[PDB]
Chains A and B, each alone.
With several copies, the nearest count.
Chain A
Amino acid sequence: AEVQLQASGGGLVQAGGSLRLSCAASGRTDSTQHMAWFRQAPGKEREFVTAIQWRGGGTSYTDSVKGRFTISRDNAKNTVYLEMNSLKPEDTAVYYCATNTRWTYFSPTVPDRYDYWGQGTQVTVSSAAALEHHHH
């Protein structure tokens, strides 16, 4: 457990709303080569969302989130952000950030190629149903 990942930023928003997920890396961050985000919707398989190179900063995205999601990292701190705009009901899922240690140029897209994992963050996009939650 050389590297620890702290994830946050999940919430409940309406369609078209925005959220920002964060994944702060601690420990031996020097060995980190790629940081990625995965998501799992109800009754569906874990799907790759986005990833970033820890050194160079090159980014990758799955087709369904291109243009709406943007991953970023200021090179001096070990916290990566995933800005999620124009959220759709299909984005409702549990989001997981992960890191690896093997150097590759392209960020891997399968969970087994990542070594360290953060806590799941729940993201829910609801059609005029947050009102009841606001009241409670």
Chain B
Amino acid sequence: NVTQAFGRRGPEQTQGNFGDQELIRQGTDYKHWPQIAQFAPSASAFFGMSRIGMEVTPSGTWLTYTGAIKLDDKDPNFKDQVILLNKHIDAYKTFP
């Protein structure tokens, strides 16, 4: 369960926003999870392409990160990949 491991989906920066009810409940057992995991960066890509920072707050010391992974419109499944990713991006807004 995504909620137990990484918290509730929400509009805050402290909160993750990815995942509909199926993906939250099933997690990696979601049918199309491998099609999503392929876009996750490797260790080298993460620290190589992302813009990294450091903040010392009352809650602790945080390694901040942000970046952009180019999707290949050339991939035959590009349209399906975009649809799949959009299905889970900010899906919490339509939750009961």
In the assembled complex, the CB of A34 is this many whole angstroms from the nearest CB of chain B, namely 10
Nearest-neighbor residue (CB-CB) of B64 within chain A: A105
Asked whether, in the complex, the Cβ of A106 is within 8 Å of the Cβ of B57, the reply is yes
Asked whether, in the complex, the Cβ of B51 is within 8 Å of the Cβ of A58, the reply is yes
Nearest-neighbor residue (CB-CB) of B16 within chain A: A58
Judged by a CB distance under 8 angstroms, whether A85 is at the interface is no
Asked whether, in the complex, the Cβ of A105 is within 8 Å of the Cβ of B66, the reply is yes
Q: Which residues of B contact A107 (CB under 8 A)?
A: 13
Bound-state Cα–Cα, A59 to B14, Å: 8
> Chain A interface mostly helix, strand, loop or mixed?
loop
Interface size on A, residues (CB 8 A): 14
Interface size on B, residues (CB 8 A): 15
Asked whether, in the complex, the Cβ of A104 is within 8 Å of the Cβ of B53, the reply is yes
Q: Do A105 and B53 form a contact, CB below 8 Å, given A56-B64, A56-B66? A: yes
Judged by a CB distance under 8 angstroms, whether A124 is at the interface is no
Q: Do A106 and B66 form a contact, CB below 8 Å, given A56-B53, A59-B12? A: no
Bound-state Cα–Cα, A56 to B62, Å: 13
In the assembled complex, the CB of B67 is this many whole angstroms from the nearest CB of chain A, namely 7
Bound-state Cα–Cα, A60 to B62, Å: 16
Asked whether, in the complex, the Cβ of A58 is within 8 Å of the Cβ of B12, the reply is yes
Interface residues of A in 47-90 (CB under 8 A from B): 53, 55-61, 72
Interface residues of B (CB under 8 A from A): 11-15, 51, 53, 55, 57, 62, 64-68
7 A–B contact pairs at CB < 8 A?
A: A56-B64, A72-B11, A103-B53, A103-B66, A105-B66, A105-B68, A106-B68
